[PDB]
Structure 1
Amino acid sequence: SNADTLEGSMAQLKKGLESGTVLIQFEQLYRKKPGLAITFAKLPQNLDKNRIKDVLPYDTTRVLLQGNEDYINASYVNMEIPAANLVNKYIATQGPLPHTCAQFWQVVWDQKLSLIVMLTTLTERGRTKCHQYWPDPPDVMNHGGFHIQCQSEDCTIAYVSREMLVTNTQTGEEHTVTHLQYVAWPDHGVPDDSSDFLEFVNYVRSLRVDSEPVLVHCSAGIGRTGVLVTMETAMCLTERNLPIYPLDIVRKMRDQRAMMVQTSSQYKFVCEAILRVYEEGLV
């Protein structure tokens, strides 16, 4: 709460969106933190595990797999609210490729993650965005020694909710995951409907479990993923009457996974949404 009140930070944000200063400061923020090594992601055996050749995890915050081939394009992203004894944990990752679905489910299993948030359709205007790593009901899939079954599938206008049963085939052990797929948010763009987006972020927040990471991905794992992380962080701050500086939220994300929030229009969108949530909270 140190630099301003919440009220003051919102007046600053509103004034700066109108004047242009908020986007000028965004444009000057580094997209990749200089000084953080990126080496494992570039190793010859890992190149085909990256959906986009230059969207890569930092060494220090990459998610490790157990075994001989430890690599997945995934990053730990933890958002602190220090004035509240609160850290919101995420794993930010890409949409799996046909041959990385086994590693994707390995992360879910190893960490017993109960919530996956997918922010892309499988394809867009003829371009592949994500491999379908879950079965249609009532098919089954096997990925890397995990048997996957869809127990329910409930569509809404903006998103699909699926309950997935993950079974370790070698031991019979079972784990249930809630899978949320937001289908109304195009790549490098903003949500088709701002109200649907905010309801969805609410819903995600309601499913978060204490001290367990939420796995979030789009196609590359940085743009729409970064907007969601920024929004959830801001909602936590406004409810606690703590000041919100979106530029610092984005910087804190980018120190953990490069390039989060890809476009200036995405940033403008999330800043406007933050002002809306704030104003609604005053009511």
Structure 2
Amino acid sequence: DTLEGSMAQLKKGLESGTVLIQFEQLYRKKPGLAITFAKLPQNLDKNRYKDVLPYDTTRVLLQGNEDYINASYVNMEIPAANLVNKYIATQGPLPHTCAQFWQVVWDQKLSLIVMLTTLTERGRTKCHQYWPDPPDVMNHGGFHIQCQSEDCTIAYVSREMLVTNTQTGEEHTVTHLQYVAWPAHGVPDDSSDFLEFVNYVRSLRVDSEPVLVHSSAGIGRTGVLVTMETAMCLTERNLPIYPLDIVRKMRDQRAMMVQTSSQYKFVCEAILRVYEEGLV
């Protein structure tokens, strides 16, 4: 089909109820994909949530290092545009997984981290603070981390971080965006702030470099962000958008991406809004 046609069907299906029914029918975890490493005794407490685990096939491995991390490669292709948007989707680090988190960032010289959670919710810790408050310097697994800049906007905090390899003396800079106006299991507090943030993240991509995206579990709010970026690329290229195909494609790489029906409805509505705003 076409962008126009897909948007007609999405509009109609939003009004029907059919897009939500097909969403609830979709598997959360792809049947047949092995999940073994994540459940080993030495790895169980490296998962923030017992039921949010990486598939073996797309699990991120540390270079020449056997340590496990709960993280998944997630790549979204737009073949008609010879385009692949790469991500590493991961959980909020735990105190004892900060070393592995920063090792992924170092291994792959990732320049952009997108964090879609506050540190705490309702008196409980949802992500370890794996960076230091400026101007402190923090050690994690033989990386020193310092926050060189910290600036708050409405909806998010932008930090520039310096990662130093203690073994080698090498340095790497990372941009870190913490979206703080988006509670777990919910929709963003403001749709317009969210859309602007997504387009800002797009603009900060480095060629063929994955964006590291995480939340607390790294599936709900991350899935929404990924869905939206994908849809923005498609809409700008006049290509059809099937949100269910996009969610399925993510879930073939990391189970459970896009947690709630309310999140799926939100992103479908936002996709329609962007198409219509942009339509000439």
- Give the TM-score of the pair, scaled to structure 1: 0.98
* Alpha-carbon distance, 1:281 to partner: 1.2
1:140-163 C-alpha deviation (Å, 9 max, x unpaired): 101010010101001011000000
Measured after TM superposition, the shift of residue 67 of structure 1 is 4.8
Deviations 1:147-193 (A, max 9, x none): 10101001011000000000001211010000000000000000000
**In the aligned structure 2, how far is the partner of 1:68 from the partner of 1:195?**
42
> In structure 1, how many angstroms separate the alpha carbons of the residues matched to 2:62 and 2:44?
16
Q: Secondary structure at the match of 1:99?
A: helix
Q: Distance in 2 between matches of 1:188 and 1:149?
A: 31
For residues 245-282 of structure 1, the C-alpha deviation after alignment (integer angstroms, 9 at most, x for no partner) is 00000000000000000000000000000001111111
Q: Secondary structure at the match of 1:63?
A: coil
Shift of 1:68: 5.3
* Percent identity (aligned): 99
1:125 and 2:118 matched: no
Cα distance in structure 1, aligned partners of 2:279 and 2:227: 20
2-side partners of 1:54 and 1:19: how far apart? 32
CA distance in 2 between partners of 1:46 and 1:180 (Å): 28
| Structure 2 unaligned residues grouped into runs of 5+ | none
Q: Deviations over 1:192-240 (max 9, x none)?
A: 0000000000110000111100000000000000000000000000000
CA distance in 2, matches of 1:129, 1:67: 29
SS of structure 1 residue aligned to 2:42? helix
Runs of 4+ with deviation above 6 angstroms:
none
Secondary structure of 2:149 counterpart = strand
Give 3-state SS (helix, strand or coil) of 1:44's partner.
Answer: coil
SS of 1:95's equivalent in the other structure is: coil
Please identify, of 67-76 and 106-115, the stretch whose mean Cα deviation from structure 2 is larger. 67-76
Cα distance in 2, alignment partners of residues 70 and 147 from structure 1: 19
Structure 1, unmatched stretches of 5+, are none
2:248 matched residue in structure 1: 251
**C-alpha separation between the residues in 2 aligned to 1:126 and 1:29?**
33
Residues in 2 aligned to 1:248 and 1:70: alpha-carbon distance in whole angstroms? 33
Q: 1:168 to 1:229 in 2, by over 3 A?
A: same
Out of 65-74 and 229-238, give the one that drifted further.
65-74
Which whole-Å deviations, capped at 9, do the CAs of 1:77-115 have from their partners, x for residues lacking one? 000001010000000000000000000000000000000
- Quote the residue 1:217 is aligned against: 214
**Worse-superposed segment, 83-92 or 63-72:** 63-72
Q: CA deviation at 1:69?
A: 3.4
Measure, in 1, the Cα distance between the counterparts of 2:20 and 2:167.
52
Match status 1:260 vs 2:260: no
Tell me the distance in 2 between the aligned counterparts of 1:103 and 1:68.
10
Find the aligned partners of 1:152 and 1:29 in 2 and give their Cα distance: 42
Deviation per residue, 1:113-135 (Å, 9 max, x gap): 00000000000111211000001
Counterparts of 1:2-17 in structure 2 under 5 Å?
Answer: 4-17=1-14
Q: Which moved more, 1:197-206 or 1:67-76?
A: 67-76
Alignment correspondent of 2:152: 155
What secondary structure does 1:25 align onto?
helix
Three-state SS of the structure 1 residue aligned to 2:158 is: strand
Tell me, in whole angstroms, the C-alpha distance in 1 between the residues paired with 2:89 and 2:63: 18
Structure 1 residue 70: Cα displacement: 2.7
How far the C-alpha of 1:66 sits from its partner, in A, is 3.5
- Return the offset for 1:50: 0.3
- For the pair 1:26 / 2:59, whether they are aligned, the reply is no
Structure 1 residue 76: Cα displacement = 0.1
Q: Partners in 2 of 1:139 and 1:15 — Cα distance?
A: 54
How many matched pairs? 280
The verdict on how the C-alpha distance between 1:68 and 1:175 changes in structure 2, with shifts beyond 3 A counting, is closer
Question: Equivalents in 2 of 1:107, 1:81: separation in Å?
Answer: 26
